[PDB]
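User: Need the bound-state model for calcium ion:
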Amino acid sequence: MGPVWRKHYITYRINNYTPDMNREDVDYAIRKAFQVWSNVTPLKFSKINTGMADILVVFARGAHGDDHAFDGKGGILAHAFGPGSGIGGDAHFDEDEFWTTHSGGTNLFLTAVHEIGHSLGLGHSSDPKAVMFPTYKYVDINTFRLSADDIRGIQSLYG
Ligand SMILES: NC(=O)[C@H](CCC(=O)O)NC(=O)[C@H](CCC(=O)O)NC(=O)CCc1ccc(-c2cc(-c3ccccc3)cs2)cc1
Ligand SMILES: [Ca+2]
Ligand SMILES: [Ca+2]
Ligand SMILES: [Ca+2]
Ligand SMILES: [Zn+2]
Ligand SMILES: [Zn+2]
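Assistant: Bound-state model below.
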């Protein structure tokens, strides 16, 4: 078992916005991604603009201040740290990707669901049906559902 948040009220802050999308769409993608996970756990997520935000959402490129540099367009899309203080919980998105609300470029919502999974303490799944599976694939956002493996995973951490 990986680290878990020791509380059920979790704050996030969007540190900065990708120029790829309009700010409202980024807000929406991230809010919906958190909702995916709160729907199956006791966790609640609230957005703040400063202070002790647990999960900082960041768009950055290349070497961006942690020991996990990005790689330009393609390859690594994003990464996140497991629960913990400071950088713990933070989710970083490679600005060298083209972030979208849709199937073109890289879908932000789907990517954030995966990354928030990490921010909550989940590792990768070997189940190709699970959002925690290591590789990106676009699926109809309107019919997207957490797999039973994802639900198993997150419910093993929070109840
Ligand atoms: N390897 C790839 O296919 C793509 C893009 C390829 C390219 O442009 O270079 N890159 C990535 O996949 C990199 C891997 C980097 C590496 O280890 O090499 N992954 C990462 O950057 C991790 C981030 C991440 C992982 C998974 C997803 C998605 C899962 C689903 C889904 C929905 C329902 C059921 C099952 C799955 C929809 S989307 C989104 C974001
Ligand atoms: Ca943090
Ligand atoms: Ca990349
Ligand atoms: Ca970009
Ligand atoms: Zn990073
Ligand atoms: Zn991952």
